[PDB]
Amino acid sequence: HLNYHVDHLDSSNSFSVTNAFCSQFSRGVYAIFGFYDQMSMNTLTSFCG
Amino acid sequence: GANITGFQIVNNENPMVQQFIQRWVRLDECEFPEAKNAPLKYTSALTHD
Amino acid sequence: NTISIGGLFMRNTVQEHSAFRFAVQLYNTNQNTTEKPFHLNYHVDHLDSSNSFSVTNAFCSQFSRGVYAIFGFYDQMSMNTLTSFCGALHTSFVTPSFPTDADVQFVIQMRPALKGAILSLLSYYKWEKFVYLYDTERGFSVLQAIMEAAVQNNWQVTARSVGNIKDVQEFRRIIEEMDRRQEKRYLIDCEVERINTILEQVVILGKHSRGYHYMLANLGFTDILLERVMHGGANITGFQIVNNENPMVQQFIQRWVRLDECEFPEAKNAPLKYTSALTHDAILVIAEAFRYLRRQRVDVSRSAGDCLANPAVPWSQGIDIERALKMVQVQGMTGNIQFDTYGRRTNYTIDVYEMKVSGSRKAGYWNEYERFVPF
Amino acid sequence: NSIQIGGLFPRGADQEYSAFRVGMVQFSTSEFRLTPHIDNLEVANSFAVTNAFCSQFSRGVYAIFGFYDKKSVNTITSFCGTLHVSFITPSFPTDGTHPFVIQMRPDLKGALLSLIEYYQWDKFAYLYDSDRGLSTLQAVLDSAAEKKWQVTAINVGNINNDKKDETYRSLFQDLELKKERRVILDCERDKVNDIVDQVITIGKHVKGYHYIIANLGFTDGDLLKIQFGGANVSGFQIVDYDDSLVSKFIERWSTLEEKEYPGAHTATIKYTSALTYDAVQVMTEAFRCLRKQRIEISRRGNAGDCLANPAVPWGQGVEIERALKQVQVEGLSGNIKFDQNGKRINYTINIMELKTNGPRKIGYWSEVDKMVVTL
Amino acid sequence: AVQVMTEAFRCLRKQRIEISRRGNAGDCLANPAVPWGQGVEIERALKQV
């Protein structure tokens, strides 16, 4: 069975983004589906990496 | 009379796209916003993929 | 011993903030110990005002520190919050802002009402037909007074709310329509910034100076940019509560322009706004009130705690402080300062200015008793 | 499952509370229900409104249903917007944009301007109440130049105040001296007859007057031509008793026991009570699909949590806000749909006149087209 | 910058002498933000130098 949890993120802020990623991360997800833009990309891909 | 050149990665003649779409436009706007008042964006096809 | 007050500052109150520090500084550095029985302390919070949430939080923060009174500013959006909390917690708010339309308690309003002077001058000039352009940034009181007087006196007033106009073309369209009605006389009850914008469109248009009369209902007369309109032959009438010939104003100013721009921004790159003079006078009124409470051996403690504590019981000294604030009679930069039971300036003087092609001069004064007296 | 909500009711909103309770029964199912926590407050007091809102925030509700007035609307908008808790309300809609607010009440200004044009009025009195608000008057004044309207605006909110004699003088000058016979009444619906009664004692040839009742509940009070001295009376209605949904509701509402359900046992329902019932439908439709968070304990709220606890994370609160704004249902107030700012769109306001046999729908105003259409 | 911080801070309130302890990055998500009214006093002190 495939489950998911969604978080909506503004992306205007690197702080807002890190917090949303870390929240989802502490829940114990096996992968993340999502979107980045020019501002949020480095945060998300660096944490994922 | 202009020439225009464009690019797509979604073929609407592909039976897989066809089958998705026929189900997709039958979803109710409450559980599934943007399925009936907007053509399918290619990023939505990528989300499915 | 030490009396602490709160200071609630808004956007574009930098100079008033500087005038506030400086007036408190003058109070504390006074040698004479009779005039300075206690040390006066304050804590400042800057508030956006766009938000009722942001405002409540800033007030409650200052309130939990245990202040004996609050000096500050409100606008149309924040006024209800601040005055309702001050009223519920019996905490006195002392302000240079527009006086409230409603009768409230615990708000000492340093700025006099303008409507009585406006009505007297309309009568002096015998305006029976005119244009009234207004925004509502300073309340609905003047607007409502003009509308009703128009009925009672059978005037022909053409009134336009222009507080939402962002496109200057709209001001020109309005003026052209007024032209087609042969309007020559204008009462403008707007923020200085917006009056400046209107006078500018008047200049761009041309031929709206000679034969015209603009009555500018804003105590910020000295910040209005009206020189181009004066040069074209227009009549202008203005209002002030600050006399630059008053020795008290003179003495403040001479010290004020010697302060360094670091500790005191807006003291050297900007003429003194009348609200800054009111900010100084507010400190005179607070000092006097507490000097009085001391003299009278009335005490005041607070503690203070949570502004939303329920209940909800205000301190008993609250009433005495308010009473002490409202009973003062002091002379300040804005002349004689006194208050009625609703914290409104009473027995104040408004100086009336006239600009004509023959020159500029104080044309007379207005007070509640003698109304308009020309000289 | 169940979802906790707040309900903040002003003193005197008895029928609205009955409608809220009836809505909770109607729209509950064995599979989903709302669990309300009701506070009863002085909506004019921003400190009290802050305390109530913050107590609900503290309890951890999915949304707050409630009311505001002119003095407290900024508290609600700023607190909603900051804490990220949705507020759904039948109160007057705000002129500007504000997140986390769902406005059940359709705008009236558009339909009013259109109705003035429809009757081809070029001169009229506008009787307003400043404590109620001036937004609609301002819309009329803004349009008056372009539309060629001579408006005489009179604040009848002062008809019992200290400005009472001024108010009567104003009414007298317009009705007796200027012989005005077209009158717009922008007031609380249950104040119409009191204001009209005064107009009738002051004016003359009153049978020839034409009133427009600028309020969304034309038939919320008794409409007896005799009470209006034989005049023409026009107005607006958002609850259509010809609608099967509404007539079925009234068939049920009209037998509820009046002691148990204050304001019920009537053949009509006040538009604000109708909007309150509709709000329960909207919340029910919005929430029934949201995630069933782990069953937690609901505890009395502490207002101090407004300052002690952080705001609801925006990404969490916005899901509830969006769910509310996406609702599309038919209710007592007709078609209910919201734009991205929580304003009603695609609604219809019925245009009514008082005829021989009683009030009759003569036409309608749709939000999409914005003109009066004749039936 | 050391001069600026020194000039800004030398007049700020002498908060009760507390113990300084190694930090935990997780507090970004575990602890609330510094109340704005508190932090803005330090910000303003720096900007006034």
Curated annotation (Swiss-Prot), chain B:
Domain of life: Eukaryota
Residues of this chain annotated as glycosylated in UniProt: 3
Location relative to the cell: Cell membrane; Postsynaptic cell membrane; Postsynaptic density membrane
Family note: Belongs to the glutamate-gated ion channel (TC 1.A.10.1) family. GRIA3 subfamily.
Quaternary assembly: Homotetramer or heterotetramer of pore-forming glutamate receptor subunits. Tetramers may be formed by the dimerization of dimers. Interacts with PICK1, GRIP1 and GRIP2. Found in a complex with GRIA1, GRIA2, GRIA4, CNIH2, CNIH3, CACNG2, CACNG3, CACNG4, CACNG5, CACNG7 and CACNG8. Interacts with CACNG5. Found in a complex with GRIA1, GRIA2, GRIA4, DLG4, CACNG8 and CNIH2.
Misc. comment: The postsynaptic actions of Glu are mediated by a variety of receptors that are named according to their selective agonists. This receptor binds AMPA (quisqualate) > glutamate > kainate.
Reported function: Ionotropic glutamate receptor that functions as a ligand-gated cation channel, gated by L-glutamate and glutamatergic agonists such as alpha-amino-3-hydroxy-5-methyl-4-isoxazolepropionic acid (AMPA), quisqualic acid, and kainic acid. L-glutamate acts as an excitatory neurotransmitter at many synapses in the central nervous system and plays an important role in fast excitatory synaptic transmission by inducing long-term potentiation.
Protein name: Glutamate receptor 3
Organism whose genome encodes this protein: Rattus norvegicus (Rat)
Name of the encoding gene: Gria3
Swiss-Prot record, chain C:
Extracellular side: 1-375
Segments forming a coiled coil: none
Glycan-carrying positions: 32, 235, 347
Main location class: membrane
Gene Ontology CC annotation, any one: dendritic shaft
Compartment list: Cell membrane; Postsynaptic cell membrane; Postsynaptic density membrane
Disulfide cross-links: 60-307
GO biological process: long-term synaptic potentiation; modulation of chemical synaptic transmission; protein heterotetramerization; protein homotetramerization; regulation of receptor recycling; response to fungicide; response to lithium ion; synaptic transmission, glutamatergic
Lineage top rank: taxon: Eukaryota
GO molecular function: AMPA glutamate receptor activity; amyloid-beta binding; glutamate-gated calcium ion channel activity; glutamate-gated receptor activity; ligand-gated monoatomic ion channel activity involved in regulation of presynaptic membrane potential; transmitter-gated monoatomic ion channel activity involved in regulation of postsynaptic membrane potential
Function of the molecule: Ionotropic glutamate receptor that functions as a ligand-gated cation channel, gated by L-glutamate and glutamatergic agonists such as alpha-amino-3-hydroxy-5-methyl-4-isoxazolepropionic acid (AMPA), quisqualic acid, and kainic acid. L-glutamate acts as an excitatory neurotransmitter at many synapses in the central nervous system and plays an important role in fast excitatory synaptic transmission by inducing long-term potentiation.
Membership in a protein family: Belongs to the glutamate-gated ion channel (TC 1.A.10.1) family. GRIA3 subfamily.
Subunit architecture: Homotetramer or heterotetramer of pore-forming glutamate receptor subunits. Tetramers may be formed by the dimerization of dimers. Interacts with PICK1, GRIP1 and GRIP2. Found in a complex with GRIA1, GRIA2, GRIA4, CNIH2, CNIH3, CACNG2, CACNG3, CACNG4, CACNG5, CACNG7 and CACNG8. Interacts with CACNG5. Found in a complex with GRIA1, GRIA2, GRIA4, DLG4, CACNG8 and CNIH2.
UniProt-recorded name of the protein: Glutamate receptor 3
Organism: Rattus norvegicus
Swiss-Prot record, chain E:
Name used for this protein in its record: Glutamate receptor 2
Domain of life the protein comes from: Eukaryota
Subunit structure: Homotetramer or heterotetramer of pore-forming glutamate receptor subunits. Tetramers may be formed by the dimerization of dimers. May interact with MPP4. Forms a ternary complex with GRIP1 and CSPG4. Interacts with ATAD1 in an ATP-dependent manner. ATAD1-catalyzed ATP hydrolysis disrupts binding to ATAD1 and to GRIP1 and leads to AMPAR complex disassembly. Interacts with GRIP2. Interacts with GRIP1. Interacts with NSF via its C-terminus. Interacts with CACNG2, PICK1 and GRIP2. Interacts with GRIA1 and SYNDIG1. Part of a complex containing GRIA2, NSF and NAPA and/or NAPB.
Function: Ionotropic glutamate receptor that functions as a ligand-gated cation channel, gated by L-glutamate and glutamatergic agonists such as alpha-amino-3-hydroxy-5-methyl-4-isoxazolepropionic acid (AMPA), quisqualic acid, and kainic acid. L-glutamate acts as an excitatory neurotransmitter at many synapses in the central nervous system and plays an important role in fast excitatory synaptic transmission.
Location of this chain's protein in the cell: Cell membrane; Postsynaptic cell membrane; Postsynaptic density membrane
Domain commentary: The M4 transmembrane segment mediates tetramerization and is required for cell surface expression.
Expression by tissue: Detected in forebrain. Detected in dendrites of neuronal cells. Expressed in the pyramidal cell layers of CA1 and CA3 and in the granule cell layer of the dentate gyrus.
Note: The postsynaptic actions of L-glutamate are mediated by a variety of receptors that are named according to their selective agonists. This receptor binds AMPA (quisqualate) > L-glutamate > kainate.
Coiled-coil regions listed in the entry: none
Reported induction: Down-regulated in the pyramidal cell layer of CA1 in the hippocampus by global ischemia.
Organism: Rattus norvegicus (Rat)
